[PDB]
Amino acid sequence: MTDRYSFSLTTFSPSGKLGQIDYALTAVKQGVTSLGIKATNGVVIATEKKSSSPLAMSETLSKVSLLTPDIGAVYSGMGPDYRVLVDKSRKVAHTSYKRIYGEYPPTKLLVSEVAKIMQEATQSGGVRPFGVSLLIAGHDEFNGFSLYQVDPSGSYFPWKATAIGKGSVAAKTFLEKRWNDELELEDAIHIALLTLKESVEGEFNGDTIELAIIGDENPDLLGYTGIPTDKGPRFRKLTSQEINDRLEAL
Amino acid sequence: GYDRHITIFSPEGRLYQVEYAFKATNQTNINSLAVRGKDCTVVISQKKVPDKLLDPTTVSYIFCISRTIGMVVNGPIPDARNAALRAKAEAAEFRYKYGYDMPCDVLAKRMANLSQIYTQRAYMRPLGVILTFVSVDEELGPSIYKTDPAGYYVGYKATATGPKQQEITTNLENHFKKSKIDHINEESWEKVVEFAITHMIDALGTEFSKNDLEVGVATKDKFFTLSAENIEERLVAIAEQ
Amino acid sequence: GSRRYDSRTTIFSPEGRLYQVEYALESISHAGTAIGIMASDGIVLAAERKVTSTLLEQDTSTEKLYKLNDKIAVAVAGLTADAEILINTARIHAQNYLKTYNEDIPVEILVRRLSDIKQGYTQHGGLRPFGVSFIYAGYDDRYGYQLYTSNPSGNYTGWKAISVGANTSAAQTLLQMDYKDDMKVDDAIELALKTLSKTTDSSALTYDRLEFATIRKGANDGEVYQKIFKPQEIKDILVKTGIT
Amino acid sequence: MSLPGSKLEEARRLVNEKQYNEAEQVYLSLLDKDSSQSSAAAGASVDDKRRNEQETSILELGQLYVTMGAKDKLREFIPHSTEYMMQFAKSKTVKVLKTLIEKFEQVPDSLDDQIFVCEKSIEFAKREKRVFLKHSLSIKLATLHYQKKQYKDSLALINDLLREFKKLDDKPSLVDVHLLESKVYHKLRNLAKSKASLTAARTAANSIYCPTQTVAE
Amino acid sequence: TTIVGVKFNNGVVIAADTRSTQGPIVADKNCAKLHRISPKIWCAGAGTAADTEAVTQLIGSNIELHSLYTSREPRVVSALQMLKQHLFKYQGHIGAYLIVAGVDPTGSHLFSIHAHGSTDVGYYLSLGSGSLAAMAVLESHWKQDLTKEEAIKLASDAIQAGIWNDLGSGSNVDVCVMEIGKDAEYLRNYLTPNVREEKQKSYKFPRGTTAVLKESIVNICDIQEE
Amino acid sequence: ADVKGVCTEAGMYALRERRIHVTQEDFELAVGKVMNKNQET
C-alpha cells in the first residue's frame, strides 16, 4: 500500500546540504557530552550516564554495548535509535561476515556497514534519519588501534581524540592542549576523566560515569582457554567501583 | 504549521509528535504505584468508577501477558489493548524459539523497538500509551521496566504516572533514603501489598475503597490479581495499627 | 516563475530543471575541489578535503580518493555518505564484466551503468538524486588514457583537465592558461598543486589536506608503476614543486 | 610474609609498641635488601610490583623524620626519588612529591626545610615533563612565604608569573593564584591591589567549581 | 567417530576423538570435531562434518546474537531449540549429528539431536559410528553422582573403547570439562595411545633426482595495478 | 565595528586600575574578552 508522495525525500536546504543533517547535529549538540581517545598502547572511551528520575537504576541503561569484543562503542545521540541500530548492525555483521568468515568482524568493514544503515534511513523515504552519533573504537592486527567517528549524516572519519555533546566545542580544544600522541593508555584515562568532568560537575563519581577501554587480550574474560592461539576479548568494561578507585588517585 | 504534522525532523531538531504522544497519557488521569520488594512485586493502579451501567470488574488497567508477567498501562485504553496483544504474541513466540521464561528486561526491549518502528513509518502512528512491565525474574528477582511510547525504557524503584505522579515519587523517594535499600522488609508478600497502600493514601491524601483501586500481585512462578474480597481484606489489617 | 514548486521528481520547472537538482552541484561546490588531469604518459588526480579539524587523521583515510579497481581510479566530490552505495555498486558491476568475460572492465562499460543509477532516482520513484561528481581515470588500449566527469545526471563528457567543487570557474581558468599540448606527468603534478593553492583560502597548503594519486607509465627506470601516495611523500613533493 | 604491604603494616604498629627505629629499618629493608625481580630502573630494589608500596613507606619515613628531628636528612631524600620516577607511575611526581609537601602541612615543619624542597627541586624529575605541569607546586611556593612573613621575593615572582599563566597553562588555576595575591597586599595594607585581585578571582570563579577549598575562602 | 559425555555434581564433561575419516580412507590424523555454540556451551559433530560446521555457524551466530542482546547468557535449551527447528524444516535433509552440552545459571544439561529431527535428553549420551561400542562401557562401571576426577577417567575409557574397536574412531582424545561457577577447561590431546613411529629407513631425495622441463618465476609480492 | 570593541576593552581594564597607560598585560586581556563577546549572542 503506497499513498501518493509519502516516500518524498525532497526536503533540501537553500545552501545545498541536507536539512535533516543539520537538525540531527543540532539535537546531538545539546545532548550529554561523550568523548573518546586513541592512545599508543590502548583506546579509552567515556561518557556520563543519564539521571532523569532519582529512583532510576543505572544498571538498566547501558550507554556502552558490545558487538564483538574487539571493538568498543559509545553514543551521545538518540537513546532509542541506538538499540535499533545495534540490532541491525549485528545482523548485517553476522550475515555478511560471520555467516561467511565465521570470525570477529574487522573494524574497517564493520564501520562501512554501520554507515549504510544510517544511509538507508535517508535513502528510503518516509523514515527519519538516525540521530545517533557513534564513536567506534577498536583494535585489530592490521591497522592496529583505530578510533572512528560515525556522524548521523552517514559518513565516518578517524580521530586521535574527539568528543561529542554539549561541551564538544570546549572539549575539542582541551584534547589538543592536554593530550598528545606520545601519551599512552594510562595517560589517556586520566584525561578522559578530567575532560568528561568539565562537562557536568554535579556528580563526578562512578555511578553516573560509564568507562570502558580496549586493552590487551584477557584470558579470564573469554571464560574458556583450551587453545593458547585463540586471543581473548580485547574489550573490557570497567566496574563503577573500579572507576572510583582511579578518581581518588587523580 | 506543517512542521508539527511531518514525521521527519522539525526546525528545532526535535520531534513534536513524540511530545504529543504524552498528551493522551493524561486523558484517564490514573496514578499507578509499583514498587520492587524482596521476593515479590506489588503493583497498584487506580480504577476509574463509572456509572451503574458499567461493570467495574471488567474495567482493568492491568493485563496478564504470560506466566509471572504482567503489564499496567496508563493512557488510552483502546490503544492499550492493541499493544497488549503485541506483548502477548511476542511472549509465546519467544518460548517456541528458546523454551525458557521470557524475562522482563527483554520484553521491554521488544515492545520499545516495535513502538519505535511506528515512529519511523510515515503511515503507522506511534502508540500513545505507557508500557510498564512487571514480573519476578529468576536471576534478577523483582524488576520494573517502564517503556516510554517512543521506545525508551529504564528501570525504576517506584514508578509513578498521572498528574499526581510528583506526589507519589517524592513521598516514596524519602522513604527509600531512610532505609537506604530499594527492597522492602517483611519478606512475606502478604504485608508488602499493604505497605504500598498506606504510602499511596498518604501521598494522594485520599483514602480509596476496594472499588476505587486494583492491586496486581507478582509472585514466584505465579501471577494473579486480587479480587474485591482480597483487596477489602488488605484495608482491614491496614486500618488496625 | 511566480511560485517555486518543488515537490516530486515528475514536476518540471518552467526553466526545465528540477529544483532538487539545483542544490546537487551547489552542495558539491560547497565541498572540496577535485581536479583531474589527463596527460599523454598517464593521468594525475589531485583533490583537497573538506575537514578543517587538526585532530582528524588525514594520513590513513582518503575521503575523496577511492580505488574501484587496478585500472579505473576515481574521485568522489559531493556528499560522502550518499556516494557509498554507488561506489560499491560500481565495484560489483566492474567485477561482473570481469566474472563473465574474464577481462578487465574499460571506462565506458562502467560509466554507462553508473549513469542509469543516478537517473533511476529521478526517473521512477519519489526518491532523491544523490549529488556526486565522479572523475573517471581509467586505462584503455583503444583510445589510450580516458578522463570523464559524471555529474548527478546520467551523462558523461570527455575532458583533458576537469575541475569541480569549489572555485570551478576559478580553477578551470588556471588550467587552460598553463595547459600544454605535450603535458608530461611531472608538469601535470605542478599544475595540479599550483592550481589548488590559489583556490584554497589556506596559503600554506599543508600536505595532509591534499589527495595525491598518479596513474602513470612514465615512472622511474622507464616502467609502468602504480601507487597510492601517502601524505608523507606528498610533503616532499610540495617542497620540490616550490609550494612549501 | 615476603610482601611489600605485609612488612609495611607490621612495622606501622612497632612505633608505639617498641620504638620508631625498628619501623624505619623495615621500610629501608623493602628498598635495598633483596627484592630483585625482572628488570626496571629504581636505585634500590628491582620489580614492577614493588613500586607501589615503596612510595607509601617513604611517606611514613618522611613523617617520622620531621617529628623526631631527622628532617635535616629528609630534604636530601626527596630529590633522590628522581631515579624511581623512571619506573614507578611513569614519572608523575604528583603522586609522590605533592604528597611529601602535604606531610609538612599536617605535621609542623620548619620553614627552612619547607622552602628548600621548593627551591632546590624546583625542576621536577625531568626537563620536558614539567614544562606544562610546573604550575602544580608553583602555587604552594608563594604560600610558604606567608608563614615566612617575607612579601618581597614572593610578590616579585607573581609579577612575572601572571604573564605566563593567562590561558597558557591552566585556566581555573588563576582562581587560586589571584586568591593568594590578595593576601600579599592584605598584610601590606593595599586595598587597590587586593580588591582588584579578589574581584578578578571571584568573577572567573563562575566558570568552574572547586571542591569547597576555594569558594569557601 | 565417537562422542561421549557425562554429567556430574558441578557440571558436565564431554569428550571426542581427533580422528576424522572420510570414506574408507582416513582423512586427517588429528582433527578437532568440537565446535562452540557459546563460551560455556560446546557441541561435537558426527556423521557429515560439513553439515556440522554449516549449521553450527549459522545457528551459533543467532545464539551469540541472543547473548549480548539480552545482557544474559542463554540457557542450554536455547541452543537445542533453534537447532531442532533448523533440522525439522528440511525434513531430515541435513545429516548433521550434534550433542548439546553446556552449563547455565539454571544447572547442568545434556542433549542430543539427530538428522531425523528428534531430540533426546539423558544423563549420558553417545553419538557416531562408535556409539554402539561406547554405550556398553557406560552401562557397567558407571556409578551415581561421580566426582570431577571420576568423570574424566570414565570419559577417557569410553572413547578408548572405540579406538581399538570402531574403525573411524582413534588417534587422540579431546576432553572438555565444563563446571558450573568456574571457567570451562578444554584439554587438548588428553588421551594419547601412541605417537608417530620412526620409519626403518630415512627418505631424503637430493636435488637433481627429478628432471625439470621449464622454470618460471611468479611474483606474489605487491604488483603494479596499472 | 567590532575592532572598536577591542579599543573599548583596552580602556576597560585600565579603568578598573585607574591607569591612563596600557601595558602589554592589558592587550592579552582585551583580546580575550572580545573573543568571548563576539561568540556570545
mmCIF file of N, CA and C in Angstrom, chain A residues 5 16 34 51 80 97 102 120-121 134 143 154 203 205:
data_model
loop_
_atom_site.group_PDB
_atom_site.id
_atom_site.type_symbol
_atom_site.label_atom_id
_atom_site.label_comp_id
_atom_site.label_asym_id
_atom_site.label_seq_id
_atom_site.Cartn_x
_atom_site.Cartn_y
_atom_site.Cartn_z
ATOM 1 N N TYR A 5 2.979 10.712 -2.505
ATOM 2 C CA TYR A 5 4.394 11.052 -2.456
ATOM 3 C C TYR A 5 5.071 10.636 -1.155
ATOM 4 N N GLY A 16 22.193 23.833 -0.035
ATOM 5 C CA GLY A 16 22.519 22.621 -0.748
ATOM 6 C C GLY A 16 22.706 21.402 0.132
ATOM 7 N N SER A 34 29.796 13.103 25.411
ATOM 8 C CA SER A 34 30.642 11.922 25.372
ATOM 9 C C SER A 34 32.012 12.309 24.824
ATOM 10 N N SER A 51 20.617 10.765 34.493
ATOM 11 C CA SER A 51 19.998 10.784 35.818
ATOM 12 C C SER A 51 18.482 10.648 35.708
ATOM 13 N N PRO A 80 16.878 5.627 22.012
ATOM 14 C CA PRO A 80 16.145 4.515 21.381
ATOM 15 C C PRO A 80 16.735 4.066 20.055
ATOM 16 N N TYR A 97 29.372 -11.331 7.244
ATOM 17 C CA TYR A 97 30.704 -11.750 7.663
ATOM 18 C C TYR A 97 30.669 -13.062 8.440
ATOM 19 N N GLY A 102 32.971 -16.452 9.645
ATOM 20 C CA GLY A 102 32.849 -17.044 10.966
ATOM 21 C C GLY A 102 33.911 -16.634 11.968
ATOM 22 N N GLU A 120 20.398 4.114 4.666
ATOM 23 C CA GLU A 120 19.127 3.521 4.262
ATOM 24 C C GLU A 120 17.943 4.267 4.864
ATOM 25 N N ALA A 121 18.115 4.849 6.052
ATOM 26 C CA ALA A 121 17.061 5.686 6.615
ATOM 27 C C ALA A 121 16.896 6.969 5.811
ATOM 28 N N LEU A 134 27.901 8.046 16.730
ATOM 29 C CA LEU A 134 28.586 6.871 17.245
ATOM 30 C C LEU A 134 30.096 7.058 17.201
ATOM 31 N N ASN A 143 45.557 -2.500 11.013
ATOM 32 C CA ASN A 143 45.664 -1.075 11.297
ATOM 33 C C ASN A 143 46.046 -0.779 12.742
ATOM 34 N N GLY A 154 25.880 9.981 8.007
ATOM 35 C CA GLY A 154 26.193 8.744 7.320
ATOM 36 C C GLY A 154 27.645 8.569 6.931
ATOM 37 N N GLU A 203 27.820 15.551 39.661
ATOM 38 C CA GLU A 203 28.290 14.321 40.288
ATOM 39 C C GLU A 203 29.414 13.744 39.444
ATOM 40 N N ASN A 205 31.259 11.078 40.459
ATOM 41 C CA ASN A 205 31.536 9.717 40.890
ATOM 42 C C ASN A 205 31.312 8.736 39.738
#
